[PDB]
Subunit: 141 residues, 2 copies
């Protein structure tokens, strides 16, 4: 009847950084310090997504990450929940572009007041222009 | 209180992808047993299913490197392995003066009718190319909808 849920999205203007905005947070969940703040204990369904693009390809090796992290009330420690890593640049270019999305999602026990980050190593290579399909969200079960 | 489960790779085990529930941020609730490396469904229903793996490689030895990931189901009554989800990735079009590492994740998933006592199985062909360097890089769970 009041099952916690949240879904947020990126900020296209924010000069090289993944700021989560214009926010659909319901039934307790908050967005504080760019971090989904849980409102109660239980079983939750946690996902996210981010998108990349680079013109050409630089020879110094390009390595793109994404990571959802739990900061538990139990230990105040930044535990990795979901994470991925990508190698767009294998060959240098001609100078033609490339695009690469990353998405994560799992079911997770969470506790009253656990904070959840969602971050990336290289905000400079974001592709904000793709109708803003760079999101983050959670859902109680 | 619906059956669910989320299990991650054991970082100890080398030449295999062993799933673990008894870890930080992993679980099995309401009858989703883990046995013979397989998730096991307590009762019949619509289930969300998903899995992720990640293949690091330290340079391209050759072009013919070929990575797979697959989630399959083995119903009791029928008994054969029915593939559900599937991926093939050849991450080396040409061998790389220096190595220059290459990563390659594979996320799979969908929503699937399951019978009681079905045995889901998320597997790969090259666990030598796995990456446990950081946590949360390799998992496999279900949720009853
Ligand atoms: N990350 C992601 N985003 C959107 C949805 C989503 N869900 C579904 C959900 C979401 C809310 C309430 C209920 C079901 C999951 C949530 C938790 C755990 C697991 C999944 C989950 C399962 C199976 C498949 C996927 C999935 C998603 N996105 C792709 N992308 C789309 C773009 N184009 C390339 C393919 N592919 C597969 C995701 N997860
Ligand atoms: N990219 C994306 N990725 C995941 C979900 C998602 N959407 C859908 C969407 C897609 C395109 C454009 C607009 C809306 C939503 C996005 C934001 C907020 C909400 C939804 C959203 C919509 C419709 C249904 C649901 C939904 C999920 N899960 C359950 N169940 C309840 C019973 N327990 C098991 C879970 N029920 C409903 C969720 N979009």
């Amino acid at each position: 009847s009041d099952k916690p849920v949240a879904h947020v999205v990126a900020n296209p203007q924010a000069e090289g950084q993944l700021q989560w905005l214009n926010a659909l947070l319901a039934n307790g969940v908050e967005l504080r310090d760019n971090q989904l703040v849980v409102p109660s204990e239980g079983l939750y369904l946690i996902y996210s997504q981010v998108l990349f693009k680079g013109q050409g390809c630089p020879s110094t090796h390009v390595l793109l990450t994404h990571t959802i992290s739990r900061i538990a009330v139990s230990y105040q420690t930044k535990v990795n929940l979901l994470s991925a890593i990508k190698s767009p640049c294998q060959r240098e270019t001609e100078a033609k572009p490339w695009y690469e999305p990353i998405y994560l999602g799992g079911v997770f026990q969470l506790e009253k007041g656990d904070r959840l980050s969602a971050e990336i190593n290289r905000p400079d290579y974001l592709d904000f222009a793709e109708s803003g399909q760079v999101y983050f969200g959670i859902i109680a079960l």
